[PDB]
Design a protein around this ligand. Sequence first.
Ligand code: CL
Ligand code: NA
Length: 129
Amino acid sequence: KVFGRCELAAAMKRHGLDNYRGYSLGNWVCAAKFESNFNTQATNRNTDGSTDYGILQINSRWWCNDGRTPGSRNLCNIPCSALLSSDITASVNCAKKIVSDGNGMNAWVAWRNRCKGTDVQAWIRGCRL
Ligand SMILES: [Cl-]
Ligand code: NA
């Protein structure tokens, strides 16, 4: 599913991401925009043979099992295919584990390089939440 900006913001708030670990909703919408273009089916192969899955481009080396990343961990205890669902529940629950791991949202390259230090509230401007 390709979400709209305010549609995604609303679903992300319903799932408890607003101010989770101190990260305002706009941070999560900004990250999703630049990681996946709001597309739950986005996949990207990395140079290390791992693959990123879903709206937040969660990686198979650490967080999910795709059956083709040898010597990888599955810290969210989920098949990577679950992160491609139109329902973002699995992506949100796994993201809550990643952001609590110690590095916050710096785990997401696109957040650090395109959202951090910007006016992220602009991403939720005009949305009924
Ligand atoms: Cl933090
Ligand atoms: Na894995």
